[PDB]
């Protein structure tokens, strides 16, 4: 079936787990189709086997590093001629942020992966990274419609590029998606001809359809206020109020929300590295460059999240492995639990490229500006399960596995601060 794996690192595993080499190094690999935010071609192309026939690369113009002549070698020169580039020119303040791998094998088989890392050496090896791996698919006529397939095809169509239509989508269309009939493909696109991001996801959650309500987000960046005049966070003031029914599509005052959360027993979580977690990371601040929360300008926004919603959670120092310590992860997860043993059984879980920003998600009235993509596990969509099951990789079969500890621990309000890259 589909499985989450923890990306091996050159630093953390010196002498379950996956490498780009496992994904691309297979002798039976015929073609890869790739989507990423950043490409370091000499890092990436060394991952492949000589047998590969085609590598179609979808990327943002200006993010594909070519190989320098002095870095070239005869092997790489061979793989380079197999590469086809599809460059997307993004508007300002917009990112092609999707990570996606579509592999085609000798015998007509297909496999899809959603790695959390971009295809660069340092980002791959320094922060913790995960990879979602699809079950094995086969080129073959299709039976019944598969929501995952249909959504993927919508997503591909939303680029409005002939190269994607012809080189990618036609190929995807030939694959039978039956093994993915339980799961959902959730995406953001800037296309105005296709609904996506938060608005679409909210609607999907409504359609798919007292206790404490836990809502957890793990994100590598945290956006600023949705509003210039008031402190309003995407997770606390919009997404959670929508998911819970506190609000419906046509933002509440902070204090109203705080009373609503108390009355409905809503618990918000955001997992983001503390300043101190870098001290107890084995490569120290080496992975810190990829964790962006710029809260020194509007301090009351930070304090509202930290003190009023008490939203921030950190790793359990007692549960982490020696070799990885408290190194943060660049994966993103959004999950809901309805109840220590919290998050082991979920109502739903989204694993995605999308960070907690309005640029990734859009709002009710604004479309996303990014391309993003992820996979949704929902309890009401499974067959042989009641809930989505989830475990931590820190203890290493469940539906989902996460790089953070379970449980996560509240920030100590006397001591802990969110890592501020400034």
């Amino acid at each position: 079936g589909a499985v989450f794996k923890l990306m091996k690192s050159d630093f953390y595993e010196r002498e379950d787990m996956i490498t780009l080499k496992d994904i691309f190094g297979t002798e039976t690999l015929k073609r890869s189709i790739l989507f990423s935010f950043q490409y370091e071609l000499d890092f990436l192309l060394r991952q492949f086997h000589q047998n590969v026939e085609n590598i179609t690369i979808v990327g943002q113009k200006g993010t594909i590093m070519p190989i320098e002549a002095r870095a070239m070698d005869a092997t790489l020169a061979v793989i380079l001629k197999k590469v086809k580039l599809i460059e997307i020119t993004m508007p300002p303040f917009a990112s092609h942020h999707t990570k996606l791998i579509i592999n085609f094998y000798d015998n007509g088989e297909c496999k899809i992966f959603l790695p959390s890392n971009n295809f660069t050496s340092m980002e791959t090896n320094l922060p913790q990274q995960v990879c979602w791996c699809s079950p094995l698919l086969k080129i073959g006529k299709e039976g019944l419609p598969v929501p995952f397939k249909r959504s993927l095809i919508e997503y591909l169509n939303s680029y409005h590029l002939k190269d994607i239509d012809e080189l990618i989508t036609k190929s995807v269309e030939e694959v039978n998606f039956a093994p993915l009939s339980e799961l959902e493909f959730v995406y953001s696109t800037p296309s105005k001809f296709q609904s996506s991001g938060l608005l679409s996801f909210y609607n999907k959650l409504e359609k798919l359809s007292d206790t404490a309500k836990h809502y957890l987000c793990q994100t590598s960046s945290i956006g600023t206020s949705l509003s210039r005049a008031r402190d309003e966070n995407l997770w606390t003031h919009l997404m959670i109020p929508l998911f819970t029914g506190i609000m419906s599509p046509p933002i509440l005052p902070t204090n109203s929300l705080i009373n609503e959360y108390s009355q409905r027993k809503i618990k918000p979580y955001i997992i983001f590295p503390t300043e101190q977690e870098f001290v107890t990371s084995p490569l120290k601040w080496s992975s810190s460059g990829w964790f962006h929360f710029q809260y020194l300008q509007k301090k009351s926004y930070y304090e509202m999240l930290r003190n009023k919603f008490k939203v921030f959670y950190k790793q359990d120092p007692a549960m982490v492995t020696r070799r990885r310590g408290t190194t943060p992860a660049r994966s993103k997860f959004y999950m809901h639990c309805a109840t220590s043993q919290v998050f082991k059984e979920l109502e739903w879980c989204l694993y995605t490229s999308a960070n907690l920003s309005q640029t990734a998600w859009g709002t009710v009235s604004r479309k996303p500006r990014n391309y993003e993509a992820g996979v949704l596990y929902h309890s009401r969509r499974l067959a042989n399960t009641r809930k989505v099951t989830c475990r931590t990789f820190t203890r290493d079969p469940t539906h989902v596995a996460v790089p953070f500890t379970l449980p996560v621990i509240p920030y100590d309000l006397a001591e802990d601060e969110c890592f501020c890259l400034a």
Side-chain angles (χ1 to χ4, degrees), residues 94-119:
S95 300
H96 180 268
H97 188 256
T98 298
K99 310 88 171 70
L100 182 57
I101 302 173
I102 307 168
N103 276 357
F104 296 89
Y105 298 91
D106 282 333
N107 56 4
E109 295 170 339
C110 172
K111 213 131 173 298
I112 302 177
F113 308 77
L114 285 151
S116 60
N117 55 303
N118 294 310
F119 301 127

Short mmCIF file of all heavy atoms in Angstrom, two decimals, residues 94-119:
data_model
loop_
_atom_site.label_atom_id
_atom_site.label_comp_id
_atom_site.label_asym_id
_atom_site.label_seq_id
_atom_site.Cartn_x
_atom_site.Cartn_y
_atom_site.Cartn_z
N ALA A 94 5.34 34.56 -5.86
CA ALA A 94 4.67 33.32 -6.20
C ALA A 94 5.71 32.24 -6.45
O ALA A 94 6.74 32.49 -7.10
CB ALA A 94 3.76 33.51 -7.42
N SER A 95 5.44 31.04 -5.94
CA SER A 95 6.38 29.92 -6.04
C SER A 95 5.73 28.66 -6.59
O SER A 95 4.60 28.33 -6.24
CB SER A 95 6.98 29.62 -4.67
OG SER A 95 7.67 30.74 -4.17
N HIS A 96 6.46 27.99 -7.50
CA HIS A 96 6.13 26.64 -7.90
C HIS A 96 6.69 25.71 -6.84
O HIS A 96 7.85 25.29 -6.90
CB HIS A 96 6.73 26.34 -9.27
CG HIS A 96 6.43 24.95 -9.76
ND1 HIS A 96 7.26 23.91 -9.53
CD2 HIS A 96 5.33 24.44 -10.44
CE1 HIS A 96 6.72 22.79 -10.05
NE2 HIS A 96 5.55 23.12 -10.61
N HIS A 97 5.88 25.42 -5.82
CA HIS A 97 6.41 24.88 -4.56
C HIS A 97 6.15 23.38 -4.44
O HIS A 97 6.81 22.69 -3.68
CB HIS A 97 5.89 25.80 -3.43
CG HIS A 97 6.58 25.40 -2.12
ND1 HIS A 97 5.98 24.69 -1.13
CD2 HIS A 97 7.89 25.64 -1.71
CE1 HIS A 97 6.84 24.47 -0.11
NE2 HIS A 97 7.93 25.08 -0.50
N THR A 98 5.26 22.86 -5.28
CA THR A 98 5.01 21.41 -5.42
C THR A 98 6.27 20.55 -5.51
O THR A 98 7.21 20.89 -6.24
CB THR A 98 4.16 21.15 -6.69
OG1 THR A 98 2.91 21.80 -6.55
CG2 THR A 98 3.96 19.63 -6.99
N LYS A 99 6.31 19.45 -4.74
CA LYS A 99 7.30 18.38 -4.97
C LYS A 99 6.52 17.13 -5.33
O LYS A 99 5.56 16.77 -4.64
CB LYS A 99 8.18 18.10 -3.74
CG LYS A 99 8.83 19.34 -3.10
CD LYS A 99 7.93 19.98 -2.05
CE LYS A 99 8.68 21.08 -1.27
NZ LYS A 99 8.96 22.27 -2.11
N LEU A 100 6.93 16.46 -6.41
CA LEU A 100 6.15 15.37 -6.98
C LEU A 100 7.06 14.60 -7.91
O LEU A 100 7.84 15.19 -8.66
CB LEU A 100 4.88 15.90 -7.69
CG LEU A 100 3.94 14.83 -8.29
CD1 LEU A 100 3.48 13.86 -7.21
CD2 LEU A 100 2.72 15.43 -9.03
N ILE A 101 7.01 13.27 -7.83
CA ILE A 101 7.81 12.40 -8.69
C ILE A 101 6.83 11.41 -9.26
O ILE A 101 6.09 10.78 -8.49
CB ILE A 101 8.89 11.60 -7.89
CG1 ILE A 101 9.83 12.55 -7.14
CG2 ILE A 101 9.68 10.63 -8.81
CD1 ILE A 101 10.80 11.86 -6.18
N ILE A 102 6.84 11.25 -10.59
CA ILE A 102 6.06 10.21 -11.26
C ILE A 102 7.06 9.35 -12.03
O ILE A 102 7.70 9.83 -12.99
CB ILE A 102 4.97 10.81 -12.20
CG1 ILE A 102 4.08 11.83 -11.44
CG2 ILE A 102 4.17 9.70 -12.86
CD1 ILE A 102 3.17 12.70 -12.32
N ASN A 103 7.25 8.11 -11.56
CA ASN A 103 8.20 7.16 -12.15
C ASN A 103 7.49 6.17 -13.04
O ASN A 103 6.39 5.76 -12.71
CB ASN A 103 8.99 6.45 -11.05
CG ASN A 103 10.17 7.28 -10.58
OD1 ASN A 103 10.42 8.35 -11.13
ND2 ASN A 103 10.93 6.78 -9.63
N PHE A 104 8.12 5.80 -14.17
CA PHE A 104 7.59 4.74 -15.04
C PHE A 104 8.68 3.69 -15.21
O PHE A 104 9.85 4.03 -15.43
CB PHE A 104 7.15 5.26 -16.42
CG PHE A 104 5.98 6.22 -16.37
CD1 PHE A 104 6.18 7.57 -16.21
CD2 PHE A 104 4.68 5.76 -16.48
CE1 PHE A 104 5.11 8.46 -16.17
CE2 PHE A 104 3.61 6.65 -16.43
CZ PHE A 104 3.83 8.00 -16.27
N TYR A 105 8.28 2.43 -15.08
CA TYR A 105 9.24 1.35 -15.02
C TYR A 105 9.15 0.53 -16.31
O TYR A 105 8.23 0.72 -17.11
CB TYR A 105 9.05 0.52 -13.74
CG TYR A 105 9.27 1.35 -12.47
CD1 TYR A 105 8.21 2.02 -11.85
CD2 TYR A 105 10.55 1.49 -11.90
CE1 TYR A 105 8.42 2.80 -10.71
CE2 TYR A 105 10.77 2.25 -10.75
CZ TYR A 105 9.68 2.91 -10.16
OH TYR A 105 9.84 3.67 -9.03
N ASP A 106 10.13 -0.35 -16.51
CA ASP A 106 10.22 -1.21 -17.71
C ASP A 106 8.96 -1.95 -18.06
O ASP A 106 8.52 -1.93 -19.22
CB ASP A 106 11.36 -2.22 -17.55
CG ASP A 106 12.69 -1.60 -17.81
OD1 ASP A 106 12.72 -0.62 -18.57
OD2 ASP A 106 13.71 -2.06 -17.23
N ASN A 107 8.39 -2.60 -17.05
CA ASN A 107 7.26 -3.52 -17.22
C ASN A 107 5.88 -2.85 -17.21
O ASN A 107 4.88 -3.51 -16.94
CB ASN A 107 7.34 -4.59 -16.11
CG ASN A 107 7.36 -3.95 -14.71
OD1 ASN A 107 7.23 -2.73 -14.56
ND2 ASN A 107 7.51 -4.78 -13.69
N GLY A 108 5.81 -1.55 -17.50
CA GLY A 108 4.52 -0.85 -17.48
C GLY A 108 4.05 -0.36 -16.11
O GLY A 108 2.97 0.20 -15.98
N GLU A 109 4.85 -0.56 -15.07
CA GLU A 109 4.50 -0.06 -13.73
C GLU A 109 4.81 1.43 -13.50
O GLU A 109 5.70 2.01 -14.12
CB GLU A 109 5.17 -0.91 -12.64
CG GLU A 109 4.66 -2.34 -12.64
CD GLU A 109 5.46 -3.27 -11.74
OE1 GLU A 109 6.63 -2.97 -11.39
OE2 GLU A 109 4.90 -4.32 -11.38
N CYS A 110 4.06 2.02 -12.58
CA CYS A 110 4.20 3.43 -12.26
C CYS A 110 4.19 3.61 -10.75
O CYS A 110 3.49 2.88 -10.05
CB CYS A 110 3.04 4.21 -12.89
SG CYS A 110 2.98 5.94 -12.38
N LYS A 111 4.96 4.56 -10.25
CA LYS A 111 4.98 4.88 -8.82
C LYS A 111 5.10 6.38 -8.63
O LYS A 111 5.85 7.04 -9.36
CB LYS A 111 6.18 4.24 -8.15
CG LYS A 111 5.96 3.81 -6.72
CD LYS A 111 6.47 2.37 -6.59
CE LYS A 111 6.45 1.91 -5.15
NZ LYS A 111 7.35 2.70 -4.29
N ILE A 112 4.40 6.89 -7.63
CA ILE A 112 4.33 8.31 -7.39
C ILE A 112 4.87 8.56 -6.00
O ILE A 112 4.56 7.80 -5.09
CB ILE A 112 2.89 8.86 -7.53
CG1 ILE A 112 2.36 8.54 -8.92
CG2 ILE A 112 2.84 10.37 -7.24
CD1 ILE A 112 0.94 8.95 -9.17
N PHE A 113 5.68 9.62 -5.86
CA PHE A 113 6.27 9.97 -4.58
C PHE A 113 6.04 11.45 -4.34
O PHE A 113 5.97 12.23 -5.31
CB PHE A 113 7.79 9.70 -4.55
CG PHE A 113 8.18 8.31 -4.98
CD1 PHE A 113 8.20 7.95 -6.33
CD2 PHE A 113 8.61 7.37 -4.04
CE1 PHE A 113 8.59 6.67 -6.73
CE2 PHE A 113 8.98 6.09 -4.42
CZ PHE A 113 8.97 5.73 -5.77
N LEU A 114 5.91 11.83 -3.07
CA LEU A 114 5.84 13.23 -2.66
C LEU A 114 6.93 13.38 -1.60
O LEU A 114 6.67 13.15 -0.42
CB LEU A 114 4.48 13.61 -2.08
CG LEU A 114 3.25 13.82 -2.98
CD1 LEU A 114 1.96 13.49 -2.25
CD2 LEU A 114 3.14 15.25 -3.47
N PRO A 115 8.15 13.75 -2.01
CA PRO A 115 9.22 13.99 -1.04
C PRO A 115 9.01 15.37 -0.45
O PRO A 115 8.43 16.23 -1.11
CB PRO A 115 10.48 13.99 -1.91
CG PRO A 115 10.02 14.40 -3.27
CD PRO A 115 8.53 14.17 -3.37
N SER A 116 9.44 15.60 0.79
CA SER A 116 9.24 16.90 1.35
C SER A 116 10.38 17.83 0.93
O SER A 116 10.23 19.05 0.99
CB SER A 116 9.13 16.85 2.88
OG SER A 116 10.32 16.31 3.43
N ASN A 117 11.51 17.25 0.54
CA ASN A 117 12.70 18.03 0.17
C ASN A 117 12.63 18.47 -1.28
O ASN A 117 12.05 17.77 -2.11
CB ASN A 117 13.97 17.21 0.38
CG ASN A 117 13.95 15.87 -0.36
OD1 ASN A 117 13.05 15.03 -0.17
ND2 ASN A 117 14.95 15.65 -1.19
N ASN A 118 13.24 19.62 -1.56
CA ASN A 118 13.61 19.97 -2.91
C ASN A 118 14.83 19.15 -3.34
O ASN A 118 15.57 18.64 -2.49
CB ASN A 118 13.91 21.48 -2.99
CG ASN A 118 12.68 22.33 -2.73
OD1 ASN A 118 11.61 22.11 -3.35
ND2 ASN A 118 12.78 23.25 -1.77
N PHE A 119 15.07 19.06 -4.64
CA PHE A 119 16.22 18.33 -5.17
C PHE A 119 17.57 19.07 -5.11
O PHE A 119 18.23 19.25 -6.15
CB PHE A 119 15.89 17.88 -6.58
CG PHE A 119 14.67 17.02 -6.65
CD1 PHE A 119 13.62 17.33 -7.52
CD2 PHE A 119 14.58 15.85 -5.87
CE1 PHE A 119 12.49 16.54 -7.57
CE2 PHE A 119 13.46 15.05 -5.93
CZ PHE A 119 12.40 15.40 -6.78
#
